[PDB]
């Protein structure tokens, strides 16, 4: 319909990737980009699984992998136990129903895997365009092992 | 009605994103990229709501959020009280008939939320292409707290 | 399909308008009347915005305007700062998922604009037909600056 | 099967709404306006559920809510314990084969929720047109706590 | 395509009519109701065709007529177009503020160029067309205002 | 649409005013989709709606006077003499509205009316018919009220 | 599409029925089996009513009926007052949005009918396949008057 | 590619359900019944995710939930820390090319969540038909805490 | 013609934008990108329609705006007074006729608005691909206040 | 059919290119991008056609070329296929682990059979293709690794 | 697709390296949908893209030297004598890449180049063109850089 | 036709006044049979008349200043600094008239004319443009007069 969606999505993806590469710490990607509302609802906690849950699991794995990497052939592989880790979360406010679904999924994943709620840091940004700039500060904070970005974009 | 509409839009979007990431301050992107003048008018101060109002609201929220951030789980969320903040508006001069509407909407939003007109700053660029080059110089000032870029793009 | 929807919607609209006109205080209208479920979901906090958020903003503006009106040419215009105001909320229970979405949006709007949660008064009525009669009491209460009605009707 | 189905339905709906607004007591509108006898039967004590049961439940909830109202944020919500309340049923006599079903459903709902049959009051009007004229006189009694209007309309 | 348009339009029309009949003073209905943005913009942009001018002119004539009526051939009552010394109150919807400002400027221009001073015009803004009736009723209850004009835009 | 809103609102206003003030208010609003049929209906001598409006107003006024003053039967007369009327005519489409006003006044005079008692008011728009007719109906000297107008789609 | 849905649904239904018959206590069935997402959303608290609410009401009625049965012609019929009863709830985690909708509906029904929240026992199982095995323990617990199973299955 | 695909699938599903109900311990059913080899491959370690990983996760959650259960309102929810549990895997040997993938996925899930390989137990049955007969004997051991059945079915 | 039209166009546009943002010096981009030759001829034939004049006036306005920026509300604008300014033109050699037309238009615009030919520095680059690399050096030359890039690209 | 595929693929490609240009050491792109699972499986299963072998071979040649370049006719620089004494770091996506393991085994077999010892290979696993760039950048910043290979699968 | 990703990435790398290192880097990547049109374009004596690449590199190097050393006009010469070049050629489709390299070297020699100064590098894949050309461009002895390759859909 | 009569009369009046008063009277009037082509000529900011008309007025004012105050070549610059203008507008066709007036004023201000030196006068019909323009030109402070109007053929 409009190139607004294309520009927003490409820009946020490029910003998140550049931020992750420059700051050298994992930033997970939970921006559900959908053409219609049906598939967005499907991926927002419905039959196709919670993308927030998947992103939280990926963040846990990446944090453990980086811990093991900094601390025959040697194989580097991170566990899924999230005990003793601190995660940062950035969530868009647009489409707040699906956003809250994803946030609940991610928090549930972290808590069930072992992360205490005292370690989760949540930041709400008005739109998905503002995710990279806030994620920059959340990642530059040294007490954040991994950052997660969460948002919804629908054509 | 620019022929290289996609090129100009991509360049200005990437420029604004890179400037925001480098300068670590909110640069809201309220730009109306419409494929037809019908939807351009429908988004410029009409049924779908003017982009200027939404951009100003997002800028206020991001400014408050950044102030709080630089100042169970910890939740950082920005208010909507623009009393005591400084904003810098950049406006393209190509399509005056709609840019004036967007600028009026943004200024009205700021004033109603509580921002004095003595604090905002307006910079008129001739074309939508040279939005980020001026936006960077505007944001580099330590007095301006948030930046709002405004332009119209038609193919 | 059936004239039940037509009768319910027309009756509730007429009742709300007559109540507002007779009691001389703002009553905002958040009755999402939709032909299908898709557009109802769209307007219930999805891409088309939160009608509860819009109604809360309208109620804040009307309350401020009435305060200024009771307390070249003179122009009367209300601000959007909701500090020191008390709002009444009436919410239908039918379609409680979308209703809770709208209620969360409205409460979030009021709290972010400045209204303390100690001033919001919530009343749940079983159906949208019962909104006018309860809104009558909520508006006849003298401590309520503005009333909001919230409901969902789907053909 | 009345020819002026739309006229009668609109008049009775507006009458019930105006009576409820003027008398400030709940008058539940459980009336089955169906375009065809098939859906009329489908709604009268069948797969879609009888209107009488829903109307009685709504009346009980509204009566409890009004009792509580006249007696963080404050939330007023009505229970479903009809023990100790007084209800007045108005029933059209046009289509007995379905009105009897609706009345039986409503009385059963009240009795099961805990309302003694000594407290309810039933008034049989000949046609659906003269529902509000009797409903007003019934509601004006200070003993009756809630009113339930019941009728069948077919085109 | 939603019944929201129909309900809002019918309700605001009924509210304005009831207010006019109750308070016995002229309230003029400058509310465009259009199915297409094209025709809405056409009506708003047409200088004389814009409802802001016509509603203001009708309000002036009705105010003069009421003044004359309160003040052997068949008595014929009619009002002039001289707005010298009258008082008008405009209530403008804020939705679709481009066309709204067009109509409001048209109405103010009509009043001023027909004679009314600027200090005799009171302008109130309501966030939506739904909130027009209550503000219009407040302005009409204000006994100083001689006539009321309600300006709004509704588009399907 | 806009036509529907205006027509419904003016009809509601007239009916509500008649019911509230308890005096005859007569309807002379020609609602036409095309100008041709309205011209056709107005061109007839007796076919003008103003004549029917005046006749109905006279009959209703006489019936009201009789009611206020086998089975009982009440019915109004056509003795227009000794009655007071208030006509409210729209200015839009004055070409045909003049025909209708001529018909109404002619009917009243031929049944015994006095131009001294007949009172005429002109309204810029059909939307202002109820509010203007309200003053005439509230004036206790006026016995019957007639509204005249044309609405075209 | 696949027989996976058929097998899961038939197996869970058979397991629940066999468990109820063997343990001789009511187990209510809130497994929304839908071919598409539209009707599932409709039945998950939307226009077609809350199946969780219906299941909670059925469980209350069955518990009261069993109490009366254990404690002209004699007619056995249970009331709807849920005062002094303890209910067990089993909820699937798949499709957690609709599941939370159903759970909120059921808890709201119980609380409004009179059951205190100190008597509700909630158990979350990862999938709908695991509902029978957990319901077995929840029903073998002697302090549970009635058990409710809640889940969503979509083709 | 078995001809009596429906018969074998129904029999094994009913067998697993009955065994779980009788033995009162979790027997997760991760079996890939696909009508075509294309979707079989799409579900066996591909875009849709391997069934083994999901089955192992469900088994871990059910084991933790049962441990907690046998050990406002009370909410019982299982964690995802497989450290200190015992699992018994049953695997059909019909389609090795996919069963090996599923078994590798399940073992990887358990190991990453924290389960030592010294605790899991693997039993290879020749065909998918004789899954429950071995599953019962495996679950009857008091050392095995959870059971996971794995097989491929194609028509 | 151009072998890789999209690649060349995107490359030159992104290079110009990045150079402008990095050097904080206005670079105007007037390049005729057309599928056909006749479209380019149309875009270049007109006096003001040709990109030369528009690019010249845009560079003049940007230079004046920057002169204002370096040293009710505050508004920054730039007049169309080219007196006292030095510009740097970079023209592609390909499509010599169109490029010469555009360069003549730009030079005529500068002279007419009040620029002396002694301050204009012209550079010729053999290909459009080499426009940004030369523009970088021309802009790094502090003698120049604004850079202009002129070229024709045809599919 | 979603733009998620396009965004992920373009972003990982840009990240790998930027890392290679910044750190001046060869990073090879063994990431299959396919619209159909059929062609994805075909490319993964083809022994020589599998990207694991080709990426490893290209990495070996590039490592030798860089070694030679850092160490009257026109100077021609070229690398042999002898991986004796080099160091390689593989970063494998875990999504679609069947084809992923196929490609990883192919790459390891290529390196070992061309000469590299097993102790000189470092294998890192990332949960998704999106996380490949950061791990690849960490491995490249590790100065011990001579060349980097990024193995992944993306299917529409 | 894969072709689009590779082509876009190599173009981005070349342009970014040229802008960062402030020295001419020339493009000789033939992007063709079919092999036939690429063969047609490569078969011509002057039509080979290597000749155009070498000519543009020489002109840009001379222009850069002049810039570093009515209105002012800067423009490069074709005096290839006294210049240093670094060619990076892909190995894939060596049949046509050899034609292109021959054309480039022939142009440089005929305009005054020295094979002693000309430096050639072979890359196994087109994906490795930017990273390999980075070293040649960073070598300050090299004045111009040329990349040569073929991409076919 | 009447449209032709009006157009010829306004053109003749403007030419006569310009010649008799010796100051530039720029003529921005869009005369068209149909509103579609009227809007076609009104849009396209360069093709929009107002900007070009103001530009020509500035050029003529500068040329006249140079004239009053090898071979000798006289030519006007595009610097509106220190110049006073008088704009006459036609109220009819307000939609396009607003755009044209905005364009003319924007051109003057951007080139350097201060808003304290622009005098705008509106006339109800295009027939009244000549006499108002004559009054503005007879005013001594005004240097150039720009007459802006739309004409539709019937």
């Amino acid at each position: 319909a409009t190139p607004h969606f294309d520009y927003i999505a490409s820009e946020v993806s490029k910003g998140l990737a550049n931020l992750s590469l420059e700051l050298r710490k994992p930033i997970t990607f939970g921006v559900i980009t959908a053409d219609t509302l049906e598939q967005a609802i499907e991926r927002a906690g419905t039959k196709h699984g919670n993308k927030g849950w998947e992103a939280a699991l990926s963040a846990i794995e990446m944090a453990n992998l980086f811990k093991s990497l900094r601390g025959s052939m040697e194989i580097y592989e991170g566990k899924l136990t999230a005990e003793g880790l601190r995660f940062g979360i950035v969530a868009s406010r647009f489409n707040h129903a699906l956003v809250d679904r994803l946030v609940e999924g991610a928090i549930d994943c972290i808590v069930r895997h072992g992360g205490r709620e005292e370690d989760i840091t949540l930041v709400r940004v008005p739109g998905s365009w503002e995710i990279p700039v806030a994620a920059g500060e959340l990642a530059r904070k040294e007490d954040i092992d991994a950052v997660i970005a969460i948002g919804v974009l629908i054509r």
Side-chain angles (χ1 to χ4, degrees), chain A residues 66-130:
Chain A
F66 263 70
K67 262 192 172 184
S68 179
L69 181 57
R70 301 186 190 276
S72 63
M73 65 178 184
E74 305 298 330
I75 305 178
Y76 287 105
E77 171 185 345
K79 311 169 188 175
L80 295 183
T81 61
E83 215 289 73
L85 301 187
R86 305 167 307 277
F87 303 90
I89 304 182
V90 180
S92 66
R93 195 180 307 273
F94 198 80
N95 299 327
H96 54 74
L98 311 181
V99 164
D100 291 352
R101 244 48 59 185
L102 303 185
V103 168
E104 289 181 352
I107 295 181
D108 192 19
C109 176
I110 296 183
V111 171
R112 280 163 69 205
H113 275 83
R116 309 175 300 104
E117 278 201 354
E118 295 182 345
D119 306 352
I120 286 91
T121 301
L122 180 58
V123 168
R124 304 295 295 267
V125 293
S128 58
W129 172 270
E130 292 76 8

Side-chain angles (χ1 to χ4, degrees), chain A residues 16-83:
Chain A
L16 287 175
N18 290 17
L19 246 183
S20 60
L21 286 186
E22 294 186 42
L23 284 182
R24 294 176 54 183
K25 66 165 50 186
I27 295 182
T28 324
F29 182 81
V31 180
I32 301 183
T33 65
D35 314 6
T36 58
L37 178 54
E38 325 293 338
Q39 39 194 169
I41 296 181
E42 289 177 359
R43 288 173 177 82
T46 331
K47 53 181 181 179
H48 278 46
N50 195 326
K51 195 163 184 177
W53 214 86
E54 303 179 2
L57 188 58
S58 301
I60 294 171
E61 180 183 324
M62 286 297 297
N64 289 122
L65 173 62
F66 263 70
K67 262 192 172 184
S68 179
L69 181 57
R70 301 186 190 276
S72 63
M73 65 178 184
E74 305 298 330
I75 305 178
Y76 287 105
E77 171 185 345
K79 311 169 188 175
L80 295 183
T81 61
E83 215 289 73

